[PDB]
Structure formats: C-alpha cells, structure tokens
Amino acid sequence: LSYLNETVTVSASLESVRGNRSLFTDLEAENDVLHCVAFAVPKSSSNEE
Amino acid sequence: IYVLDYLNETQQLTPEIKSKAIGYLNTGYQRQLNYKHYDGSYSTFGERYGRNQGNTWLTAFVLKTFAQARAYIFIDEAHITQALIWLSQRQKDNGCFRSSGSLLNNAIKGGVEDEVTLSAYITIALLEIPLTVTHPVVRNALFCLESA
Amino acid sequence: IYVLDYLNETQQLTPEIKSKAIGYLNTGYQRQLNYKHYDGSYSTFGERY
Ligand SMILES: *[C@@H]1O[C@H](CO)[C@@H](O[C@@H]2O[C@H](CO)[C@@H](O[C@@H]3O[C@H](CO)[C@@H](O)[C@H](O)[C@@H]3O)[C@H](O)[C@H]2NC(C)=O)[C@H](O)[C@H]1NC(C)=O
Ligand SMILES: *[C@@H]1O[C@H](CO)[C@@H](O)[C@H](O)[C@H]1NC(C)=O
C-alpha cells in the first residue's frame, strides 16, 4: 500500500463455495511497507474444496 | 419441474406420470450435458471443444431447474458446484453481472435483457439455490440492486 | 453398478464416489436410451434412422 489515506485495512477474506463457512480476518494498512500477514486455515468436511 | 410441483402441491397426483417425467428429466439432463463445458457452464452448442463460453441467463435457467428437480429426486452435486465457481468469478467488485452472450434466438428469454434484470435474475436465482442470503457475492449483487 | 453394490456390502465406501457413479448410472442410461429400437430391443447404430 501507499499514497494518501492509510486509514485503510486490506483483507484476505474467505467465504466458501457451498453451504456456509468462513475465515474472516483483518490486515492493517500503512503506506509503502510490505508488511505481510500470515493468516491460516483449518480442515473442512470434504478433502479438496 | 414446476408442472410436477403444480400437480404435487395441489395434490393432483399420479405415479406413472412421474415415470414419464423421469424418462423426460433424465434425457433432458444429459442433453444439457451434451452442451456444457468441463469448467462447468452452459451455452448453446458447447461440448467437444473449447471455442465458446457459458451464459449467465441460460445457466441460471439451468440451475433453477437443477435445484428444483433436485428438490424432488436424486442429484449429484460437484457439477453444479463448479458452475457456482464460474458464476462467482464473473462479476465486478462493486458492479453488476456480464451478459457474456452466446445465446440462440431473440425471444427465447421473455425478459427484454436489461443489465438490471440480467444481473438481478442471476443473483436472485442464485439465492433461489439452497444457499445463504449472506454471501459477499450476493451482497455485491444487492449493491447492484440498490443501484438498479 | 456391480462394484457399487460390492462397495455397499463390503462396507468400504467414499460416498461422492457413488454420487459421480450416480452420474454414470443416468448418463449411461440415457446415452444407451438414445440408441435403442422403437420396439424395445437394441441394435448397434439405430437412432435417427
Ligand atoms: C412430491 O413432493 C415431495 C415433497 O413433499 C417430494 O419429495 C418426497 O417427499 C417424501 C415425503 O413426502 C420423501 O420421503 C421421505 O424421505 C426421507 C429420506 O429422504 C425419509 O427420512 C422420510 O421418512 C420420508 O420417507 C421422499 O424421499 C421425497 N422424494 C421421493 C419421493 O423420493 C416428492 O418427490 C414429490 N413427488 C413428485 C415428484 O410428484
Ligand atoms: C452459516 O449460516 C447458517 C444459517 O443457519 C448457520 O446455521 C451456520 O452455522 C453458518 N455456518 C458458518 C460456520 O458460517
């Protein structure tokens, strides 16, 4: 990110493909720094969704 | 599907018209298999090749019929699932659906093809799925709905 | 179908196996239906003539 109004939050949100499940999470936003979130996921019902 | 439901809901029933419609629904189901893509979606001609893409409107008509003739009898899920991944891809962050048209004729669709009702009928048949009323996707839809 | 019942008795199943084999049932059902005789018997080439 960079440039004008780091009053921001980027996100890698997660809503799946059938039924209902999610992995919502938040990520900051300051200018021109490559601060890399390390989110994660747990298992599911079916193998390879 | 909705004639059978009309008879079933009004208690206007009879079994071997169900066997009749079973021959019907099977041959038509696999007929749709004759013209899909292995990504999943559905256009006019389709199978044996990749020189084509699906259709919002028609694949919605398809999948409404999927869900309801599913709602009486056995289905398999992975196919229509990948069809959902397709529809999921194909709309803006904040704007509406795209009528990626590879259709057949002019008045098959009784709707007059507004982008408005294009995108609406897609999302709200997608809601007529056994699916949420919560997904971000349909929220983007609802954004387009307020817009529309 | 024969191994399907085999699985159902041997007890070792993985059900989406059978969902896609239900696909196999109805698709072979109908792609065989599109080749029968008008009477009920079957030939090799048949339909549309
Ligand atoms: C007419 O409408 C019904 C929905 O009311 C369609 O679904 C069928 O509904 C019956 C119950 O009236 C189901 O029987 C039930 O099955 C479950 C297991 O899935 C079992 O736990 C219950 O005890 C009960 O036996 C039936 O499964 C279901 N579909 C069928 C008949 O296979 C019905 O399909 C409609 N018929 C038509 C097409 O006119
Ligand atoms: C999804 O929404 C349904 C609504 O009934 C709820 O029951 C279910 O727990 C939700 N699933 C998750 C884990 O998001």
Match 């004008």 to its residue by tokens. Answer: A4
Residue B122 half-sphere exposure toward CB, CA atoms < 13 A: 32
Please give the distance of CA C34 from its chain centroid, rounded to a whole number: 13
Residue ranges lining ligand 1, Cβ < 6 Å: B 4, 8, 13, 18, 72-73
The coordinates were experimentally obtained by cryo-EM
Burial (Cβ within 10 Å: 0-12, 13-18, ≥19) of residue A1? middle
**DSSP classification of residue A22:** B
**DSSP classification of residue C11:** -
Q: State whether A20 and B134 contact (CB < 8 Å).
A: yes
Provide the sign of the torsion angle of the four alpha carbons C7, C9, C14, C17, taken in this order.
Answer: positive
**Closest CA–CA distance from residue A34 to any residue of chain B (Å):** 24
| C-beta of residue B33 within 8 angstroms of C-beta of residue B47 | yes
